[PDB]
Design a protein around this nucleic acid. Structure first.
Lengths: 328, 306, 108, 285
RNA sequence: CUAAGAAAUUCACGGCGGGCUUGAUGUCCGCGUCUACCUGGUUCACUGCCGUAUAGGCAG
C-alpha cells in the first residue's frame, strides 16, 4: 500500500479563451455584433529608469547610456473612441468524475483513492466547493486588470442545455465582494448546478459574459505572449485577430478559493495549487515544513487513513478537480 | 629587463615562402627563435649603423602557418615534401638529403635604443628598416614584399618611454589591434623548472620532463586527460659547447679566418603561444640572446616576461 | 579567459579576409553586431544611430555571450545557497571589466 | 528590514490615446461631427483643432502589484500611511490639475497658437456631471500656484488618488493654431501615427505632459518643471539631471525613507509619491 | 651575418557487370509571463514656383 509512481488527473472545469469585445453600455442586451478589440502597434521610447549598477557609479560608464535612447515597439489593446464597456465572453464546461485518475500504475492504490473520494462525496457534497467556484464566477475575477478602476462590472451566466438557454443568471459583480463568500438565493441556485456537474449528475455547460465599463478609449489588458521595427518588446495574445485572455489564466482566476493556510489572519483567497504559491508574491503558503500541503495531506488520508481537518479535505478535492501530474 | 627599448618598431606583416621547418634534431614546425634574433642582427649591421640606432629585441607573432607535409596512408605521423635536386656529372640521381619547408606570415616588433631616434623623425626610421628588410631572407625563406588588391601594410613606430599612463595603455592597446589575428611565442623557462621539482614521484632530468609537457597524455579513471597550462611547445633554446674555443685560423674549413670556433650542441626548452591580450606591456614580449662565453652557453630567451 | 581570447580571435579573423557583405537574407535572430563583425567599409553602415563614429555600451555582445557561457551548463544544482557561487561571479565580473574599451577603439 | 528583489507598481493617472480632429470654428458646442485628419493634405476651412482623451484616476499609492517581501510591503504601506495622514494628495493633485488646465499635452501644436481652450468633464455615466472651461494661454504654465475654481478639480483628483470615488475625466482641447496649417501627430518607425485612419498622439506622450510636475530639484527654480522620472533625465535636449552622487534622487529618497525612517523638514516628498503614481519596475536587487 | 649559403618529380591509362530492406505500434497530463516609457537626434528625390555661369514678383 504505497503511492503510485504515475498519477494523472484530467482537469475538471475547463474554460475556453476569452474573446474581448467592445461596445457601449446599455447596448449590452444586444451584444451579438460588437466588434472585436484588436491588437495594434505603437512605438515606445523612454529613458533609463532602473537602479544603476552599484559600485559602478564612476563617470566613465555613467555618461554613456543616459543620452542614447531606448526605442521599443509594443502591442496595445484599446477600446474604440465610441465604446466604453469591455465584453469578455468564454465558455465553461463542468465534467465530473473528480477522484478518478487518468493514468495510475497500482490498482490497490486506485481502489483506496476511489473509496476515499467516494466517502468524501456522500459525507458532504460538492456544494461547498461549487459554492466557492460560483462566487469567482459571480464576481468577475477573470477580469484581472480589466476590473480595477471600473464604473460597473456586470456578469451574465447562461446554462446551455441543448442549443439554447435553459436558465439565465444576472450578477452585478461589484456588490459581490472579493474577500467574503456570502450566500444568495440565485447564487446558491448556481452552486446547485455546478455541484450537480461535479458529481456527474447531469451535463453542464456555461457561457459567461462579463461587461466592465471602464471608459471610452481606455486600455484593456489581454494576456501577454512570450517573445521569441516590428513588435520587439510586447506581444499580446489574440486568436483570429481578436484580443484574448488565455484559458489557463481564467482557470487560475476560478480556482482562487483557498482560504485555509497554516498562517492566516485574513489575506484573501489564492489559487488552489500544491505548495500553494503566488506568482505575484514570490511565496509558497503550503510549505511542507508545515504539514498542511497537498501531497502530505493526500498521502496521509489515502495511505494512513489520517482523515484531515474537514476544511483541508476541501483543499485536497480542489486539487483533484484542477488536475495535475502527481506520483513522482 | 636588460636594455629597455625607447621605441618599438612594427614590421607589420612579413610573408615568407620556404622557411626551414626542421628547426632542430628533435623538434619541427615553426622555426627557431635564433633565426629571428639573427635576422634582427642582420638588420642591425645594414641600417643600424647608418641610422646610429640599435635594433636589439624582437617579438615573434605568427599569423598564418602552412607546412609542406603529407600524411602517409596508414600512419598517424607526417613526412616532408621535397625538391628534385640537379643530377651529377655522371648522369645519375644525387642523394636525397631531405629538407622541410613552410610558408609563413609573421609580424616583428623590433626594439630601438640609440640616439638616432632623437635626430631623425619616426617615419624616416621605419621606411629605412622596412625597405631594407625586403632585401633579406628570414629562415632560409624569402621575405616576399607586398603586392595585392588591398593596400600595403605600413611600418609604424611607438616611443614607449614617451607619454603618460593613459598613453601607456592607449599606445600598447593600439598595436595589439595589429597583432591579434596571430599568436606570440614567448619563453617559459620557469614552468619547465617548477615542473621538475613537481615530479617528486620519480627523480628525472629535464629531458624526459620536457617530453612530458608536449603530451595530450591520458590519465586513468580513479578516462580523463591531465590539465592544460596553455599551448606549450618545445623550442630550441640556444647552444652549449662540446669543445674548447679554437683560435681563429686553426680550422681551414671555417666561414672566415678571423673569428673563433666552437663545436656546439643544441639546448632545448619550453615556450608558449599566447594571444597578445594576455601581454601587459609589449616590450616584455621581446627576444634577446645573451651569451656566457666563459662557459659554453650561447642562448636566447624573452627576459622580463613574468 | 581562453574563450574570451578566442572570441576576439574569431572577431579578428572575420574582421579581415571578407571583402563583401550581403546581409539581407538568412538572419532572423542575429543583430546588433555592426561593432563586432563589421569593418568600416569607408561607408555609413549606420542603423539610424551614431554607429559610424561612436561605439559605446557594448553589452550587445559582452553580456550576450557572458550569458552564452552560463547556458553552456544547466545540470549544476547545488552551487546555489553557497559561498562558492560568489566565486563563479568573480571572473565574470572580471571579463566584464577587461572587455569594454577594446571594443570602442576600432571605430574612430 | 531591507529592500526586496522583485517589486513593481502600476500606472495610476493613465490617459488614453488622444485622437486629434480638425474642424471650423463657430461649431464648437455643436462639435458632434467634426472630421479627423484624413490621410496627408490639410484644408483651410478648418481653423482650429480638437484633441480628446479620457483619463482615469485610479487610487492606491504604495500598494505594489507584485512585491516580494511582506515586512517591506507593510513598511512601505505604513510610510504611505504616514504620508497620507499628514496631508491628502491635494498638493500633487493641484499640480496635476495645472497640467490639465492648459493644453500642455499639445507639445508643438500649442506653441504658435492664438487661443487654446480646455474643457474637462467629470462623468459618472454617459451623462456629464460637472464641466470645466479653462483658457490655456491665460493660465500659468510655470509657477505662482494661483487660479480660482481650479481647487475643485484638485480636490477631485485628490479624492480619486486617495480612493474617495471613481473619477473619470473626459477632456477636449480646442487649439486655434490658425486657419488650417499642417499639424504634427506622433510618428512611428517616417510615417505619422494613426489609430483607425485618424491621427493621434501616444498615451505615454499625452501622459508625459501630466507628470511634468517637478519644479523641485537641486538647481535654482528659474527654469521650471521637469517630468517626474527616476534619475530625472531629459532624453533629447541632452541634460541628464539628478545625479546619484548627490542624494536628491528617487531611489535614494525612497530607500532612506522606507528603511531608515527619515523625517527632517523634507516635506518635498511629492517627487517620491509622484514616482509611485507613475509606477514602474522599481529596482531591485 | 639567421641548423647560414644551392636545387625541375616526370611521362601514359576503360572500374564494371547484377540486385525486393521488410512486417507491427496510444506520447500524455498539469500550468498567471508581468510592470513602465516623448523617436521634441540628422528614419529614398508623389503629375500645376519664366535659363549650370554666382543674375531675377515664395497671402506654402
Amino acid at each position: 500500500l504505497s503511492t503510485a509512481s504515475v498519477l494523472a488527473f484530467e482537469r475538471k472545469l475547463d474554460p475556453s479563451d476569452a474573446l474581448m469585445s467592445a461596445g457601449a453600455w446599455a447596448q449590452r442586451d444586444a451584444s451579438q455584433e460588437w466588434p472585436a478589440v484588436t491588437v495594434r502597434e505603437k512605438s515606445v521610447r523612454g529613458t533609463i529608469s532602473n537602479r544603476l549598477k552599484t559600485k559602478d557609479r564612476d563617470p566613465a560608464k555613467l555618461d554613456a547610456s543616459i543620452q542614447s535612447p531606448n526605442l521599443q515597439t509594443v502591442d496595445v489593446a484599446n477600446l474604440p473612441s465610441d465604446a466604453d464597456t469591455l465584453k469578455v465572453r468564454f465558455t465553461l464546461r463542468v465534467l465530473g468524475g473528480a477522484g478518478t485518475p487518468s493514468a495510475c500504475n497500482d490498482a490497490a492504490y486506485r481502489d483506496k483513492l476511489l473509496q476515499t473520494v467516494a466517502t468524501y462525496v456522500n459525507d458532504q457534497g460538492f456544494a461547498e466547493l461549487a459554492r466557492r467556484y460560483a462566487h469567482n464566477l459571480a464576481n468577475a475575477r477573470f477580469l484581472w486588470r480589466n476590473r480595477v478602476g471600473a464604473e460597473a462590472v456586470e456578469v451574465r451566466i447562461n446554462h446551455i442545455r441543448q442549443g439554447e438557454v435553459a436558465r439565465a443568471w444576472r450578477f452585478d459583480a461589484l456588490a459581490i465582494g472579493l474577500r467574503d463568500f456570502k450566500a444568495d438565493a440565485e447564487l446558491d441556485a448556481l452552486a446547485e448546478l455546478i455541484a450537480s456537474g461535479l458529481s456527474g449528475s447531469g451535463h453542464v455547460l456555461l457561457e459567461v459574459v462579463a461587461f466592465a465599463r471602464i471608459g471610452d478609449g481606455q486600455e484593456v489588458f489581454p494576456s501577454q505572449e512570450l517573445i521569441l521595427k516590428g513588435q520587439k518588446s510586447k506581444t499580446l495574445y489574440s486568436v483570429r485577430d481578436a484580443a484574448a485572455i488565455h484559458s489557463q489564466k481564467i482557470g487560475n482566476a476560478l480556482r482562487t478559493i483557498d482560504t485555509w493556510y497554516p498562517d492566516e489572519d485574513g489575506l484573501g483567497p489564492i489559487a488552489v495549487e500544491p505548495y500553494g504559491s503566488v506568482t505575484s508574491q514570490g511565496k509558497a503558503y503550503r510549505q511542507p515544513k508545515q504539514k498542511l500541503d497537498f501531497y502530505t495531506l493526500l498521502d496521509n488520508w489515502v495511505l494512513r487513513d489520517e482523515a484531515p481537518a474537514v476544511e483541508q479535505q476541501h483543499y485536497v478535492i480542489a486539487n483533484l478537480i484542477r488536475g495535475g501530474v502527481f506520483g513522482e | 629587463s636588460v636594455t629597455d627599448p625607447e621605441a618599438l618598431l612594427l614590421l607589420p606583416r612579413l610573408s615568407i615562402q620556404n622557411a626551414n621547418a626542421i628547426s632542430s634534431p628533435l623538434t619541427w614546425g615553426f622555426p627557431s627563435p635564433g633565426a629571428f634574433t639573427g635576422f634582427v642582427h642582420a638588420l642591425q649591421r645594414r641600417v643600424g649603423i647608418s641610422l646610429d640606432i640599435e635594433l636589439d629585441g624582437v617579438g615573434i607573432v605568427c599569423h598564418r602557418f602552412e607546412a609542406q607535409i603529407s600524411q602517409p596512408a596508414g600512419k598517424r605521423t607526417k613526412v616532408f615534401n621535397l625538391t628534385r635536386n640537379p643530377l651529377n656529372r655522371d648522369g645519375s640521381t644525387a642523394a636525397i638529403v631531405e629538407e622541410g619547408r613552410a610558408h609563413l606570415e609573421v609580424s616583428l616588433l623590433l626594439g630601438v635604443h640609440g640616439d638616432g631616434l632623437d635626430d631623425h623623425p619616426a617615419q624616416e626610421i621605419a621606411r629605412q628598416v622596412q625597405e631594407q628588410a625586403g632585401a633579406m631572407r628570414l629562415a632560409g625563406g624569402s621575405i616576399l614584399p607586398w603586392c595585392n588588391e588591398r593596400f600595403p601594410a605600413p611600418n609604424a613606430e611607438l616611443l614607449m618611454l614617451g607619454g603618460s599612463d593613459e598613453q601607456r595603455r592607449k599606445n600598447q592597446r593600439r598595436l595589439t589591434r595589429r597583432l591579434l589575428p596571430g599568436f606570440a611565442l614567448v619563453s617559459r623557462e620557469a614552468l619547465l623548472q617548477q615542473h621538475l621539482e613537481t615530479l617528486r614521484t620519480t627523480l628525472p632530468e629535464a629531458t624526459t620532463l620536457d617530453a612530458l609537457l608536449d603530451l595530450c597524455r591520458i590519465n586513468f579513471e580513479p578516462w580523463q586527460v591531465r590539465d592544460k597550462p596553455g599551448w606549450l611547445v618545445p623550442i630550441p633554446a640556444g647552444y652549449n659547447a662540446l669543445s674548447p674555443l679554437y683560435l681563429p685560423g686553426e680550422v681551414r674549413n671555417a666561414r672566415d679566418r678571423e673569428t673563433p670556433l666552437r663545436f656546439v650542441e643544441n639546448l632545448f626548452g619550453l615556450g608558449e603561444w599566447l594571444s597578445p591580450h594576455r601581454v601587459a606591456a609589449l616590450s616584455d614580449l621581446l627576444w634577446y640572446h645573451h651569451a656566457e662565453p666563459d662557459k659554453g652557453l650561447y642562448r636566447w630567451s624573452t627576459p622580463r616576461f613574468v | 579567459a581562453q574563450i574570451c581570447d578566442e572570441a576576439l580571435q574569431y572577431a579578428a579573423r572575420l574582421r579581415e579576409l571578407e571583402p563583401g557583405w550581403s546581409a539581407t537574407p538568412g538572419c532572423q535572430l542575429h543583430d546588433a553586431e555592426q561593432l563586432w563583425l563589421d569593418p568600416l567599409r569607408a561607408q555609413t553602415d549606420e542603423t539610424f544611430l551614431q554607429r559610424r563614429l561612436r561605439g559605446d555600451w557594448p553589452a550587445e555582445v559582452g553580456n550576450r555571450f557572458a550569458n552564452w557561457l552560463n547556458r553552456a551548463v544547466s545540470s549544476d544544482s547545488q552551487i546555489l545557497g553557497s559561498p562558492e557561487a560568489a566565486q563563479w561571479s568573480q571572473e565574470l565580473s572580471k571579463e566584464l571589466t577587461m572587455f569594454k574599451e577594446i571594443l570602442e577603439d576600432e571605430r574612430d
